[PDB]
Symmetry: D2
Subunit: 254 residues, 4 copies
Amino acid sequence: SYQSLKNKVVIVTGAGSGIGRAIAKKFALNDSIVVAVELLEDRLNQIVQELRGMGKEVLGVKADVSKKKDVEEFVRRTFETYSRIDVLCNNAGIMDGVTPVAEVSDELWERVLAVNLYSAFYSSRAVIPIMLKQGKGVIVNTASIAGIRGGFAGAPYTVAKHGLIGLTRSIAAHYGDQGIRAVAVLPGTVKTNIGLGSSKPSELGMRTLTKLMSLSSRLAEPEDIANVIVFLASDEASFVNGDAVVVDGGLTVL
Amino acid sequence: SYQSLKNKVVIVTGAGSGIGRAIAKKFALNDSIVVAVELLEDRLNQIVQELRGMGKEVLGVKADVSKKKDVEEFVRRTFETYSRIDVLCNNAGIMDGVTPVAEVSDELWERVLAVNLYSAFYSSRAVIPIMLKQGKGVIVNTASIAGIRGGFAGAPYTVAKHGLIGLTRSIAAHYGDQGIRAVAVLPGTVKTNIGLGSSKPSELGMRTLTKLMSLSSRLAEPEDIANVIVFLASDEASFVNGDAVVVDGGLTVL
Amino acid sequence: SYQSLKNKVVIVTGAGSGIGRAIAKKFALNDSIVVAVELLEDRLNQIVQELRGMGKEVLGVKADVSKKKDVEEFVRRTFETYSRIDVLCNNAGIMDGVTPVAEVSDELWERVLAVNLYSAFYSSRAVIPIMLKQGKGVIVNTASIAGIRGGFAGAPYTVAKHGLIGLTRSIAAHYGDQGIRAVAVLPGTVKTNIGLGSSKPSELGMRTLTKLMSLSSRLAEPEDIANVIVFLASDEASFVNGDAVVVDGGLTVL
Amino acid sequence: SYQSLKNKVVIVTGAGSGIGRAIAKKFALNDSIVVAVELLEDRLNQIVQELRGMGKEVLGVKADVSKKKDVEEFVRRTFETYSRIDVLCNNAGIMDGVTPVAEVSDELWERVLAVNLYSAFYSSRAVIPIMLKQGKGVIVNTASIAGIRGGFAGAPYTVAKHGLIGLTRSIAAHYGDQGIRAVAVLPGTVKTNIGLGSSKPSELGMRTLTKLMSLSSRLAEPEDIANVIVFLASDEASFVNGDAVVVDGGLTVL
Ligand SMILES: NC(=O)c1ccc[n+]([C@@H]2O[C@H](COP(=O)([O-])OP(=O)(O)OC[C@H]3O[C@@H](n4cnc5c(N)ncnc54)[C@H](O)[C@@H]3O)[C@@H](O)[C@H]2O)c1
Ligand SMILES: NC(=O)c1ccc[n+]([C@@H]2O[C@H](COP(=O)([O-])OP(=O)(O)OC[C@H]3O[C@@H](n4cnc5c(N)ncnc54)[C@H](O)[C@@H]3O)[C@@H](O)[C@H]2O)c1
Ligand SMILES: NC(=O)c1ccc[n+]([C@@H]2O[C@H](COP(=O)([O-])OP(=O)(O)OC[C@H]3O[C@@H](n4cnc5c(N)ncnc54)[C@H](O)[C@@H]3O)[C@@H](O)[C@H]2O)c1
Ligand SMILES: NC(=O)c1ccc[n+]([C@@H]2O[C@H](COP(=O)([O-])OP(=O)(O)OC[C@H]3O[C@@H](n4cnc5c(N)ncnc54)[C@H](O)[C@@H]3O)[C@@H](O)[C@H]2O)c1
């Protein structure tokens, strides 16, 4: 285990499924105190009961990270309960139907940007003051290879993930000298419940995604991403700041 | 001049000053039909007058590119007036006071993202169908080196510019086989009226920017950026699609 | 044509075929003085005849760019003949059989590196002092998308093209404030005489390459690459320095 | 510690000092079997005796990694002695006096490329067949931020490191589906014995480096780099392949 993570207070969003669930369990396995933030009631109760079963300290919070009020509330609640916030994992996200620009409705554009990008801006803005007062904090953002390439998702998701990497670089640049580290992890194809965000994704968007899927038959498990996120949050990575770490098995290096 | 630009219809946003003004004049000198879009009336009239004084065809449109209705209206007006839209230069943009995440108000965040990013999504969504009909079209987005690095502006601007490069890659990927090219130009430091976006820029943000200017040398003239934009819009650049072309004199290569 | 290129002295290596031939012709059409550097006698005489048939000024020099003495020779003869060297296009290059690391012989490794990378180091080292004295000069290196990705060629070519971009960045960073610009152009797939570099290309290497080639079907013509190289050599690109401009129709943006 | 590294055979080049010594010790503490490769005998003896003292299994090999015969020999010796090679850390390297292109002598260019790049080619070529037979292997290359930017070192070093990243991507692309992972770690400024490669570095080269070194005062310790290298060599990083991980405290994100 990473000794530096023992008793550190870690907020994990989207904790009820896939990568988020794996992140929560991995941090718990390292004796961190986990604040599991999840939109869905039953999923939240399930991950909370699992961590309790592991004999770890866990606080469950039902919230919609696209809502500023919900975010500010769980940040306040975490601080009031534990008196510190050491790690923030902005992980919750949704897909966009692989919808290309001309096919994007105002509703889709706004919702994907809100859940995948605004959420991280709200949380980072709220937690940074607390981390600065501590003189130390780490923010890990779950981006995607869609944050560096153009055909792995629709326009809303691609734009939001590029923007999320931008937010990561911004935080690292401005606050790195004050004890804050911000890093982004870019998964490729992972077996989770996110899907494509639609039972009928754009035919045009799929024409591109399907071709890219011909490049590899490898599918990562949530744990493979969580392993990297937890490492980056530990003092073992004290000098990794601002990087966009790709965890795609080599897919984008071809 | 570029023969392939003669009589082509080009929309240029932020045409009343700096890079936009230079883009409009350059296309006009290449005998393109220019639709000059600008928020400020006096600036709009000035650029319109400059092009007409050269005997060139120009249509002035006073609009706020952060408003979807204004964008959809100038696209419809351009098509109704000239029956085609060959090039779209999403150039208008504003700075963000070099404001770091913790100091960003909801207002600033929304305003910078709307002007610097949403504007481009609105215009691209509206013009793409017309370009697909034509079987040809070029979208050139004026990004910034803040779209690939984290200390050249505040968080809102950095996030918006990263998102704009993402929008560019998305369009290039999905519509490249249908005759559309989308490219981004990333200027470094250019002599214009954009400034820092505030008379009282963030102290923390400025500390960061100042460190970066220690790497700077020459200041580009707006024409130096416009020259690249116009070239990319011509058939000479038929195989440049999706790239984020850096025009910073070498600042980011250090 | 670009007025700033009229009567400028331009050295073009690998001028006897494909992209190099197209580069020589394009500069000639812009009334530049072209020094055609080529390894093969017949090809050299062919491009020289073509330029003379166009009524343009050309100097032919047979040389093997992998030999430092030969490089010093064409640089010196150019200077003796025209008293200046304004543009150096390091374009000559060969493929590597798409040979993966484990299958690379010492001879193949050295040959590919010498022809595709060392050649550009030798020529740049020789022309820089001349250009600094002039107060102005431009070096354009023809790289490849294999210089930013790993499956587009064998190991020798990929390493050499990555090194070439590094050489480009180095020159741009160190001499940019003294009037020198160094840029790289990265083509994707172009129909020329380069082939695969072997009659029996690596089975393993080909499996990877073939999958990537399946992603898109738009193939650039040599003229499409020459068009960007000539523009970058002109004063229109005075603020483009150190960038690796991708000209692949969008292949690497997917 | 990482369970997956217990009893794994790890080759560490440049093990007698700085980052390499930290790498050797870190793997030893994970109970890996360490093959310490170092040029200088006294340094080699010091690290070998240090690990032996810790009660760990270590094999010292005095070798010059720029010599193919030396590399092929320590690879054969490792396999003959331990019957397997699980991890290869190509870490040895030297600086280049921050020498810019025009000032580079053939001796400097040749030596730096040989030690910083050819060495990794020789070792990778020799160990890949062994790893392929095992169905698993990891190669970690210690590059540098000079592998992605142009002003952090002289031309030889910058070109060599860019090429090393290319070698990394090539191996990852071609062998990633066969059980091999190849990754690069890019340190910024670390307090070791490498220095600037000269007590009288190039004046011109230094003009640029000095500006970059003015961006941050935070310097990583060798252990901070070793921590990331060891993590990437473990099964925890099973889905990290072909990436160039930056460990510079945020220097290049500005
Ligand atoms: N699975 C992949 O292939 C993949 C690849 C690259 C990046 N990612 C990124 O990984 C992150 C999570 O991915 P996942 O695959 O585990 O998905 P998932 O759907 O399995 O899990 C996401 C969890 O987030 C929760 N969630 C969604 N919207 C929320 C909101 N507004 N507020 C609070 N919780 C919300 C869900 O209810 C769900 O439990 C996202 O940022 C996603 O974009 C996934
Ligand atoms: N100048 C630089 O240093 C620099 C560096 C990198 C990128 N850029 C980018 O260049 C573009 C224009 O830059 P500039 O420096 O010429 O600025 P500028 O202020 O000189 O010109 C921008 C013009 O856009 C107009 N504008 C602003 N908001 C608008 C809105 N909502 N609707 C319509 N018009 C609007 C302004 O009124 C102005 O005339 C921006 O996207 C900017 O981010 C500039
Ligand atoms: N054609 C493509 O698909 C492609 C894609 C990306 C990059 N490139 C790059 O474009 C450049 C030239 O490519 P091309 O496709 O026109 O190839 P080509 O083979 O058609 O032309 C190259 C010319 O270089 C000459 N040449 C080869 N070795 C030489 C040496 N040692 N000294 C002097 N001249 C030499 C040849 O004789 C030939 O006339 C190379 O750097 C290549 O790597 C090509
Ligand atoms: N220290 C830094 O600031 C820094 C920053 C970025 C990258 N790096 C990279 O880290 C690696 C090692 O760096 P370091 O700072 O620990 O240097 P160091 O000088 O402290 O240690 C390097 C060790 O390599 C050995 N060595 C040199 N040439 C050799 C050869 N031909 N064969 C075998 N051994 C040889 C030396 O004798 C020395 O013990 C290099 O690849 C270097 O480029 C260092």
